Amino acid sequence: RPILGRFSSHLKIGIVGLPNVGKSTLFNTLTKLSIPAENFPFCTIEPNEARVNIPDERFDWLCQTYKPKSEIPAFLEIHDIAGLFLSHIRAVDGIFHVLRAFEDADIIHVDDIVDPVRDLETITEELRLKDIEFVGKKIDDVEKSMKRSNDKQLKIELELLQKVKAWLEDGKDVRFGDWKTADIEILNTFQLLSAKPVVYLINLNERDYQRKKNKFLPKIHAWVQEHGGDTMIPFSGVFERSLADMAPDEAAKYCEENKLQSALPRIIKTGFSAINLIYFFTAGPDEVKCWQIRRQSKAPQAAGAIHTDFERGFICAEVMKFEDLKELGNEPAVKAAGKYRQEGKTYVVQDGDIIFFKFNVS
Ligand SMILES: Nc1nc2c(ncn2[C@@H]2O[C@H](COP(=O)(O)OP(=O)(O)O)[C@@H](OP(=O)(O)OP(=O)(O)O)[C@H]2O)c(=O)[nH]1
Ligand SMILES: [Mg+2]
């Protein structure tokens, strides 16, 4: 039941990397595409934070079909981090790790050596080092507490912190550890940087992105295989900045004529292997909304993601498969074909489910 990383309602992503790799440029490109801050009346959105809708053909279709009063797509929350003070980074679920694989041509800087692998080793080392500093401080705190308290939980926390210190000093990320559920629950309270899952974004000039080729990609791929097997997505920051500034008509003409497409949709939809998510929808005249929950969630746990009271008071879940609704075309048709189902406490929610939850007010 415990897993590394405490996913709640949507992913929070930190953009990390060395200076001058295009982090703030990527962030500004995503800001142009973002949900305005007025749509979150319960939240204060910091200046280096953007909320961007996850594009989903299913979500668009449901909104055409139900014509709801309000449309709430799934979204991603993205934070631009300036350098590697650490409150911003500790809070995120996962990391977009941006690598420089772009080089200038006729006008160049002296000794401006591009080496993505060298940069990978530098930043991954720096995250583990910040974890070693954090774990060092917590070991001191626990040892001081253990002078005063007899409590068994302190002896457990200490044994774990020392196992983690040794793992990190051996150059290994916490997320590649074999942690028992008891350890995972303690690790999750620490929010260690090397415990967070990663997507690698490889920043290329627009020619290399259009060509679908770069000399550094095989070297990056090889390193990533020996250090976790995480997703790699090539992009061009300069191309995405230009494309986001064009009008829809100009953008389409540019992409047709030059034979390339935006990487941003793929980047926004990719998510993380360690954080295995599915979408379910609520749909009606008032609202169509996309909900994000852990794969293999049971119906009452999906209700809990709306609010704990709907889980605790759960009675049943009336479910349509998105496929069933799409092919029959409307809810009356789905009911007539007997594909509108009453599901119970043991039902395992499926990606694309359209759910009408029933609960007891007390
Ligand atoms: N060639 C190239 N350089 C990049 C790219 N992305 C970033 N840079 C370089 O790094 C500078 C900072 O860009 P940011 O996007 O703020 O980088 P950062 O947040 O990762 O530190 C840019 O300065 P700038 O003032 O925006 O540009 P410039 O006028 O100084 O060259 C530019 O020199 C890219 O995709 N291609
Ligand atoms: Mg920056």
Author numbering: 15 to 98, 112 to 389
Sentences from the paper on this structure:
AtYchF1 is an unconventional G-protein in Arabidopsis thaliana that exhibits relaxed nucleotide-binding specificity. AtYchF1 in Arabidopsis thaliana is a close homolog of OsYchF1, which possesses a noncanonical G4 sequence (NxxE) within the G domain, instead of the canonical NKxD in most P-loop GTPases, resulting in a relaxed nucleotide-binding specificity and the ability to hydrolyze both ATP and GTP. Similar to OsYchF1, AtYchF1 was also previously characterized as negative regulator for both biotic and abiotic stresses. OsYchF1 harbors a G domain at the N-terminus for GTP and ATP binding and hydrolysis, and a TGS (ThrRS, GTPase, and SpoT) domain in the C-terminus for nucleic acid binding.
The structure of AtYchF1-ppGpp with Mg2+ was resolved using X-ray crystallography at 2.07Å. In the structure of the AtYchF1-ppGpp complex, the ppGpp molecule was bound at the normal nucleotide-binding site of the G domain, as expected. The guanine moiety of ppGpp was engaged in π-stacking interactions with the Loop A motif, sandwiched between the hydrophobic chains of Phe129 and Val265 (corresponding to Ala265 in OsYchF1). The O6 of the guanine ring was recognized by the well-described side-chain of Asn230 of the G4 element. The α- and β-phosphates of ppGpp were coordinated by the G1 motif (P-loop), and an Mg2+ was coordinated by the β-phosphate and the side-chain of Ser38 in the G1 motif. The δ- and ε-phosphates, which were covalently bound to the 3′-OH group of the ribose moiety, discriminated ppGpp from its GDP counterpart by pointing away from the active site. A salt bridge between the δ-phosphate and Arg268 was observed. The binding of ppGpp had a greater stabilizing effect on the conformation of Loop A (Arg127-Asp142), with His136 as the most significantly stabilized. However, in the AtYchF1-ppGpp structure, His136 was stabilized by Asp131 which had a hydrophilic interaction with the guanine moiety of ppGpp. Interestingly, the distance between the TGS and helical domains of the AtYchF1-ppGpp complex is 4.7 Å shorter than those in the OsYchF1-AMPPNP or OsYchF1-GMPPNP complex.
